[PDB]
Ligand binder design. Structure first.
Ligand code: NA
Length: 12
């Protein structure tokens, strides 16, 4: 989720 983690931060 690096960067903007809004929404669904699953994964990176
Ligand atoms: Na995401």
């Amino acid at each position: 989720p690096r960067x903007d983690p809004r929404x669904d931060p699953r994964x990176d």
